Amino acid sequence: ETWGELLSKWHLNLNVRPKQLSSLVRNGVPEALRGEVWQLLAGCHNNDHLVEKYRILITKESPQDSAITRDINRTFPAHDYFKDTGGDGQDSLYKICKAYSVYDEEIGYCQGQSFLAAVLLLHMPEEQAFSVLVKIMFDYGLRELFKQNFEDLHCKFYQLERLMQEYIPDLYNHFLDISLEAHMYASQWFLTLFTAKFPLYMVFHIIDLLLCEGISVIFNVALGLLKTSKDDLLLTDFEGALKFFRVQLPKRYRSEENAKKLMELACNMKISQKKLKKYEKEYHTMREQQA
Ligand SMILES: [Cl-]
């Protein structure tokens, strides 16, 4: 495209993102270019060291075989690439997940990580998918949500609710009235970056935005989802709200048009780093008092 010219430009200087990249990413990266573009966004291009390590890691046993197997059995099992249990896709998926469990000695394999691994394997080869997965967990900071009995996740829930008070006040008020807290609905959004419940078309666009702009885009998407469906939530009771989040909400985004308007709104509902850091500080101060 425009994409072709952009990639030529980028390859003249892989150290610096071209000025028009963020605007082109906002519209969605083409499927066939995501393998390359995701690697470049994440800052790995021929990351030889991680690939060398990976080749050793795959010879080691995982102490989390059972968790990994369970997750893989629920990871896009009908998809053409993953449906053959002896296929290359499923083989690669196991190896990546096991390798990760051995690589991150402190934390190990994280529940749901197979969905993210699978998203990456849908667009690039195995060894590169491992590399990108590591960068998402370590550099972008996904693994931080799993430390300290999920303390940073709890922080994100607090942040989401403060943002809702501000940008979706009617919905915030209603959720207060029915005592529905974010931990009851937003956990998989954050911990899996939407990979575990939303349709792939939408999920790929989310990764495009997340790799370009950072892990904070989960807030933008969260607010876009809540604002778009708020009228199906405002008059519901507790059970009703949960049922909506579990069944109807992901079903809406099977439509490509619905998913495109959602990512547009998410980008438009962008939240500043300054604002997020304020709310993070508020949460930390609060936790210190009660401690
Ligand atoms: Cl803002």
Using the 3D structure, point to which of 138, 162, 185 is the last residue of a domain: 138
277-280: long-range contacts at Cβ-Cβ below 8 A with a sequence spacing of 24 or more? Answer: 279/158, 279/159, 279/162, 279/163, 280/155, 280/159
Say how many domains are in the chain: 3
Q: What separation in angstroms does the CA of 227 have from each of 171, 188, 201, 265?
A: 8, 18, 20, 9
What is the distance between the alpha carbons of residues 69 and 188, in angstroms, rounded to a whole number?
19
Ligand 1 geometric centre to CA of 270 (Å)? 7
Domain boundary, last residue among 138, 159, 188: 138
CA dihedral sign, ordered 126, 115, 155, 222:
positive
Do 82 and 157 have their domain in common?
Answer: no
Q: How far is CA 216 from the centre of its chain?
A: 10
- Checking the chain for breaks where C and the next N are over 2.5 Å apart, the residues before them are none
Check whether residue 8 and residue 62 sit in a common domain: no
Calculate how far, in angstroms, residue 31's C-alpha sits from the geometric centre of ligand 1. Answer: 31
Residue where the block lists tokens 């699978």: 118
> 107 Cβ partners below 8 Å, 6+ apart?
143, 146, 147
Q: In angstroms, what is the span from residue 163 Cα to ligand 1's centroid?
A: 9
User: Ligand 1: distance of its center to the CA of 279 in Å?
Assistant: 11
CA–CA separation, 218 vs 221, rounded Å? Answer: 5
Distance CA 209, CA 215 (A): 9
Same domain, yes or no: 32 and 117: no
Domain match, 98 and 232 both: no
Both tokens of 187, joined, read 């956990």
Q: Are 14 and 44 in contact (CB under 8 A)?
A: no
- Which CATH number do you get for residue 16? 1.10.10.750
Pair 290, 157 in one domain:
yes
228 CA distance to ligand 1 centroid (A)? 19
Please check whether residues 268 and 190 belong to one and the same domain.
Answer: yes
Domain check: are 122 and 181 in the same one? no
Beta-carbon contacts of residue 35 (< 8 Å; ≥ 6 apart): 123, 124, 125, 128
Residue 134 sits in a domain of what CATH number?
1.10.8.270
Q: Experimental technique used?
A: X-ray
CA angle 138–3–15, rounded 5-degree value: 45
In terms of Cβ atoms closer than 10 Å to its own Cβ (0-12, 13-18, 19+), residue 184 is middle
Span from the CA of 205 to the centroid of ligand 1 (angstroms): 22
Residue 94: other Cβ atoms inside 10 A: 18
Q: Which of 75, 107, 138 marks a domain boundary? A: 138
Interatomic CA distance for residues 41 and 189, integer angstroms = 21
User: Would you list the DSSP string of 187-249?
Assistant: HHHHHHTTTTTS-HHHHHHHHHHHHHH-TTHHHHHHHHHHHHTGGGTTT--HHHHHHIIIIIH
Asked if residue 216 and residue 110 are part of one domain, the reply reads: no
Domain hosting residue 40, numbered range: 1-44
- For residues 125 and 123, what is the distance between their CA atoms, to the nearest angstrom? 7
Find tokens 């296929």 and name the residue: 87
Please, what sign has the CA dihedral across residues 272, 142, 93, 66? Answer: negative
Q: Are residues 96 and 175 in the same domain?
A: no
Contacts with 101 (C-beta within 8 Å, 6 or more apart), sequence order: 62, 63, 64, 68, 108, 109
What amino acid is encoded at 80 in this protein? Answer: D
Q: What is the CATH number of the domain that holds 164?
A: 1.10.472.80
> Residue 153: which of 210, 100, 193, 101 has the closest Cα?
193
Cα 84 to ligand 1 centre (Å) = 46
Q: Which of these, 8, 44, 50, 23, lies nearest to 208 by C-alpha position?
A: 23
Residues 76 and 145 in one domain: no
How much distance in Å is there from the Cα of 236 to the middle of ligand 1?
29
Residues 289 and 154 in one domain: yes
End-to-end CA distance of the chain: 55
